[PDB]
Amino acid sequence: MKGDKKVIQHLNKILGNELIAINQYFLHSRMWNDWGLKRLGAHEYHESIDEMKHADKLIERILFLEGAPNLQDLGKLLIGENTQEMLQCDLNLELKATKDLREAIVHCEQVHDYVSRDLLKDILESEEEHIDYLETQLGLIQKVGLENYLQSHMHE
Amino acid sequence: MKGDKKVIQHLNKILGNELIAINQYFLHSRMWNDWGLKRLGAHEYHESIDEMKHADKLIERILFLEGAPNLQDLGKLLIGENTQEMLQCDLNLELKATKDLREAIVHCEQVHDYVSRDLLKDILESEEEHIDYLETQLGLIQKVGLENYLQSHMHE
Amino acid sequence: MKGDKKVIQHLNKILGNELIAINQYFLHSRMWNDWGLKRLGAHEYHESIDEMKHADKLIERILFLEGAPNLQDLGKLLIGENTQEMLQCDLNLELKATKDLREAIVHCEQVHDYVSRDLLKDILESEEEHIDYLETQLGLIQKVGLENYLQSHMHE
Amino acid sequence: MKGDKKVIQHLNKILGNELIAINQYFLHSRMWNDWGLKRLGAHEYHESIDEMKHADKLIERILFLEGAPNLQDLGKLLIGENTQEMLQCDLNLELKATKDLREAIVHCEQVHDYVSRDLLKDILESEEEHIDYLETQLGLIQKVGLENYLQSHMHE
Amino acid sequence: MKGDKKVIQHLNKILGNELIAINQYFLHSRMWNDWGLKRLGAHEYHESIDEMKHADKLIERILFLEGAPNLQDLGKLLIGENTQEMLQCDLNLELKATKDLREAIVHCEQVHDYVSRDLLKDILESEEEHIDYLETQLGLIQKVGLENYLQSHMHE
Amino acid sequence: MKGDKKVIQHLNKILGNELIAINQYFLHSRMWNDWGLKRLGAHEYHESIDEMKHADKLIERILFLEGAPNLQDLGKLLIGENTQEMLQCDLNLELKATKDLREAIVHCEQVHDYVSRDLLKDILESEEEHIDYLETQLGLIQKVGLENYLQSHMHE
Amino acid sequence: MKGDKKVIQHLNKILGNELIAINQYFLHSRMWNDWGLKRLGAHEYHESIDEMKHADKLIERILFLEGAPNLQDLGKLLIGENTQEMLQCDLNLELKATKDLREAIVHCEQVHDYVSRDLLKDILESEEEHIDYLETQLGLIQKVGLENYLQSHMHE
Numbered sequence A, B, C, D, E, F, G: 001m002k003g004d005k006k007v008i009q010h011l012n013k014i015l016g017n018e019l020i021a022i023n024q025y026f027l028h029s030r031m032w033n034d035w036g037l038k039r040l041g042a043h044e045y046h047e048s049i050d051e052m053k054h055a056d057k058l059i060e061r062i063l064f065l066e067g068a069p070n071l072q073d074l075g076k077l078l079i080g081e082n083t084q085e086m087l088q089c090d091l092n093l094e095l096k097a098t099k100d101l102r103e104a105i106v107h108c109e110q111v112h113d114y115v116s117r118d119l120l121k122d123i124l125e126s127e128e129e130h131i132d133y134l135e136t137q138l139g140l141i142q143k144v145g146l147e148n149y150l151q152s153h154m155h156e
């Protein structure tokens, strides 16, 4: 089914966002696991997996719409050097991701690609939940203090 | 069954403290969830549900006694701005609530409405349990420090 | 995550409508139960629980958007005094609730708060279900007569 | 297998009658559901699924005999404005359908297409069961009065 | 609940398309079964059923909005003559159906019927899935050859 | 029960047709098994069994009507050289059987042997299902090519 | 544990080959699914996941050896335009990978990183397995013809 050319370019840019997210989160997860902070390791693993499945849905929809998914161009991964940095790196990436998603939905509505709008909304619902998770972890670092925070995240 | 007009007014006043407590404890619980203090939030939600169950039995009786239950005149919620303050706000609401129950129960006794008294004594017993919980948390903030106390209420 | 001010104002308004509905529907339920019309009491109870869950999710959404939920302001409860009027009251409240949900959806769309839009769309479909129930009961009173209608809501 | 061209004509006629029924009964079922007469909706809904199954078997048989099933020429639906009129419309349709069934069996017998005859006899048997139902609902409306009849069909 | 009269008109037009597809997919399913292409027959059978489900919802919504569902009017079936022709007819039909769905959605948004919108969107997502299936069968016919393609759909 | 002399003679004739088919189908089945076309072997085996069950019920009826079942005079088997001719041989035999079944039924009706007619109708229904099967296989050889057809019938 | 810095440069090279592999195989999978070659898509999906597991174990050995994993530099993805090109692209990549694996292993042996060698020997076995699969599919396309080969990979 021939899709709108700019819809597809939007979808490929979200995909590019999801592809940065997949790898940033995966490496952060394995750093935390590596330092002995398993609870964070595991939680960040699942965030990564989540973006993979978003990427999958985006690849699938591009192909249906007779476009060409772009998995070659990998943007800038924001890699913190401590827990507090890592969390804010992921939050910076999610805030870039959310306005880009918002850009695309406006366009889908213009051209009446409502199915693609809905796909993007469900993705946007999920990135807003990751923002909440992330912000809240920064808050808890202030309320309980970094050392307690890390302590609460050694084990599962 | 025609009731005592003043009992009904005591019952509506107790009902009135219940409705404040429902909205306050509920709002406090979501606040605590929102901040990542999910254990504090789950406890406070069950407190709110409890107050809902008292209101339901109060309403039921008022109607049996051919009064008119008052769900319209909501009073002032005591919303704290941090955890210590939120606990103390629940406490104050409860000290007020218990003084009004003791007064209701005196008048029930005087007019021989012994079933209404038994209801209020049950509720009173539940409010004193609540007070014990709140006083023990404040106690615990002091023994272990606010930071450790908040850490032990992040997860379940 | 900071959200649009007129959005949060819109949510606190929808929330205010829910709180009216919680109290009004709960009291009508206990009223129908008190009169021996257990089937109406059961159904009306479950409407009140529905409004409660909607209010929980608004409250959760307002806090994430860094707003301050308003459980303190409680509008005019519309209590009927017989079955026909309590139903007509519920309906009038629901029609006001859906005019406000539409306007608040319009606004979330303009400002690209698509997740808050989707939440409200969900609540709105719930309210339209409640409107269909309310309207059908009033038609059924006309079809089978009030006495048969009440007979059919005696037993659970 | 090449069948009698005229037998095929009858089968296609019978089919058309069943296509009217499907749509008539479905809409009637859904009108009744919409008025909160859930029991009449449910029964009428099964009458509709019933005619769909007859239609399936007529389409299969037409094809086997190398006919062309005609699902294009939808005849006149008989929609009522109230329960009693809806039932009387169902009764009118069914009585036309059995006159045609008997015509078609007469021709099947004549050309020795005994299988087709048997197919139409089994349909005829269902159609007579449906006549019996409709005549009995109309007779019960008289015996218990419309308001009781409809009360009895409010809930499943 | 009073619906916008031109929403109801669109709903009835979508209903009208659904009624064509029901009859057209069912007849195609029974042709394919009759030719021994039973995997094609079953899959086509379930596309028919799914359209019957969309019709049901559309009739249900129209009656709620005080509309009158049109099941008397049946547009032009596109009956193919062989497997390629039948699939292409189903695709042509689906392309008309998605166009009218977008048009109806634009209008629902305009008059703020966001629930009708959401329903129409769910259907559109289903219609688009049927389009992918059809385009995909047509493409496979080209990759594997018609003889093999049909071979692969003889047995269930 | 002394049955009609000519009814009994028709039943012996239909039995003779069954006896041919039994042997013809059993030999075709074992030829297809012997050539490694096991799915055709199995299917033809079950057609053989079915004609055996028909021959049983005819023998039981003939004996009840005080006749002599003729199992001795075996008509001409139509044995084919390749899959295509075997299916066509089966079909030719099935078309002679249905002709004799129709003439026997006509006679049963004139002399009012209605139970014999009902027996013969059930067999006719089975034979038409076999005619359907056989014609459909000859059509699929045309559609997928002989080599694919046979390929799809090597393994059970 | 301070590990050899050139080993760590190998591992990051092996890792960067896995990262090409993941994306390449995951796009081929989804192209195959989008063409209806669902058995090819599923098989290539699992090759993708397999490489993702390889990528995970290398990141972990690197972090433990005190190096910094590189997920930022995405190699050249070899994306075919038909099934046969797709498989040769996979094979092209896998021979580049095995070359790099053997280099890296010889170096591990020099410095006595026997444990990183054993991890590399395990990955090398996986890739040789995948080379066999890919060669065998190319050789099967010659033996059975492309139309049969794709036909056999339509369904799962």
Ligand code: HEM
Pocket: A022, A023, A026, A049, A052, A053, A055, A056, A059, G019, G022, G023, G026, G049, G052, G053, G055, G056, G071
């Ligand atoms: C750094 C690169 C990647 C790493 C390290 C990685 C790692 C993993 C791991 C460990 C799993 C779990 C496999 C299992 O044991 O079940 C997984 C699953 C998965 N991956 Fe990846 N992956 C990467 C890239 C990608 C990409 C680029 C995509 C899509 C474009 C993707 C899509 C998926 C999907 C759909 C799953 C299945 C998730 C589920 O349903 O559980 N991955 N990945």
Ligand code: HEM
Pocket: B019, B022, B023, B026, B049, B052, B053, B055, B056, B059, C019, C022, C023, C026, C049, C052, C053, C055, C056, C071
């Ligand atoms: C801001 C106001 C309120 C909020 C947010 C609220 C919310 C809730 C929620 C989320 C539940 C759990 C329902 C479920 O998931 O099954 C609940 C249950 C319940 N509510 Fe409320 N509610 C409110 C006011 C009230 C009032 C005023 C009453 C009674 C007069 C009431 C009576 C009840 C009862 C009896 C239950 C069931 C408890 C049980 O037996 O498990 N609620 N409410």
Ligand code: HEM
Pocket: D019, D022, D023, D026, D049, D052, D053, D055, D056, D059, E019, E022, E023, E026, E049, E052, E053, E055, E056, E071
């Ligand atoms: C007004 C148009 C129609 C409507 C609204 C409609 C609706 C429905 C619904 C809701 C179902 C049940 C689906 C499920 O939940 O599984 C159904 C089943 C079915 N329909 Fe229809 N349908 C229509 C036309 C037709 C026609 C024209 C035919 C055949 C020529 C047909 C054949 C069938 C069959 C065979 C079934 C399955 C019955 C069973 O459960 O065994 N339908 N229909």
Ligand SMILES: [As]
Pocket: E148, E151, F148, F151, G148, G151
């Ligand atoms: As083949």
Ligand SMILES: [Mg+2]
Pocket: A001, A063, A064, E132, E135, E136, G034, G035
């Ligand atoms: Mg496609």
Ligand SMILES: [Mg+2]
Pocket: B001, B063, B064, C034
């Ligand atoms: Mg009373």
Ligand SMILES: [Mg+2]
Pocket: B132, B135, B136
């Ligand atoms: Mg104490």
Ligand SMILES: [Mg+2]
Pocket: A132, A135, A136, B034, C001, C063, C064, C066
């Ligand atoms: Mg927050």
Ligand SMILES: [Mg+2]
Pocket: D001, D063, D064, E034, F132, F135, F136
């Ligand atoms: Mg045929």
Ligand SMILES: [Mg+2]
Pocket: C132, C135, C136, D034, E001, E063, E064
């Ligand atoms: Mg209505």
Ligand SMILES: [Mg+2]
Pocket: F001, F063, F064
């Ligand atoms: Mg005897």
Ligand SMILES: [Mg+2]
Pocket: A034, A035, G001, G063, G064
């Ligand atoms: Mg270390």
Ligand SMILES: [Mg+2]
Pocket: G132, G135, G136
């Ligand atoms: Mg080899």
